[PDB]
Design a protein around this ligand. Structure first.
Ligand SMILES: NC(=O)CC[C@H](NC[C@@]1(O)OC[C@@H](O)[C@@H](O)[C@@H]1O)C(=O)O
Length: 242
């Protein structure tokens, strides 16, 4: 039987990113790791799927949701913000991360949103950052990149003034390139990360929701958060209750 409506009932095919450190990324042997990866494998494990029964495929951010919508993957896990706009084509599990959208730059003069006037801002195609900048940073020239790596390369080259990306990923680039600093932090608590599933796949959605709640209640979520995001605040919503 196929109760979870999977492509193959013995395996879970997950669409992710090889370059979204520390959320999702690859090590030197090409295997996937990061917070979202370890959390997903933990949730899948509770559903009776061992680590060898979960396959990961790296894709550019913009291809993830359409690949799930087209039946290429059972799930997508890559700090995917939950929105009504995204809910038009896919379904989401309950939220498991809520953080900031960050402006990474070597220009100390940029201190807030109003500092982005007369600046060239990098965004990754299809991200919540692209939408936010189009709505709130009108007049700021946007430069669309397929990934963070290309955007940061143009930031290091001096072709863009700043790059707009996820807080933990901005922190990672700040460590890799010390001249780059997080100058602006924008709340994105209204779009928590959720595991993406095929629109209407209620059996897989409900089963992932059960595992996520259990991982949060037994303190697994807390342990994984402390590992991948040291010094980042943890909300009571995702921590053990009572
Ligand atoms: N891997 C990526 O490039 C994802 C970029 C971006 N992520 C936003 C977000 O979901 O990331 C995790 C949390 O910090 C959320 O609050 C946030 O909205 C997006 O969904 O568009």
């Amino acid at each position: 039987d196929n109760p979870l409506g999977l492509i193959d009932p013995t395996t879970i095919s997950v669409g992710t990113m090889g370059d979204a450190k520390p959320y999702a990324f690859t090590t030197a042997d090409g295997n996937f790791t990061g917070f979202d990866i370890e959390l997903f494998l933990n949730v899948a494990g509770r559903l009776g799927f061992k680590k060898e029964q979960v396959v990961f495929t790296g894709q550019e951010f913009s291809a993830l949701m359409p690949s799930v919508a087209n039946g290429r993957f059972d799930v997508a896990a890559a700090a995917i913000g939950t929105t009504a706009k995204r809910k038009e084509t896919v379904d989401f599990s309950d939220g498991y991360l809520a953080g900031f959208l960050s402006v990474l730059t070597s220009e100390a003069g940029i201190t807030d949103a109003a500092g982005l006037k007369g600046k060239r801002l990098g965004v990754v195609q299809g991200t919540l950052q692209e939408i936010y900048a189009e709505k709130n940073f009108a007049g700021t020239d946007l430069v669309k990149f397929p990934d963070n790596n290309s955007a940061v390369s143009a930031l290091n080259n001096g072709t863009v003034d700043a790059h707009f990306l996820d807080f933990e990923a901005a922190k990672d680039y700040s460590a890799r390139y010390p001249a780059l600093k997080i100058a602006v932090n924008i709340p994105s608590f209204d779009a928590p990360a959720g595991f993406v599933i095929r629109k209407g796949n209620d059996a897989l959605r409900n089963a992932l929701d059960k595992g996520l709640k259990e991982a949060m209640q037994d303190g697994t979520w807390k342990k994984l958060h402390e590992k991948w995001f040291p010094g980042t605040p943890m909300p009571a919503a995702y921590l053990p209750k009572q």
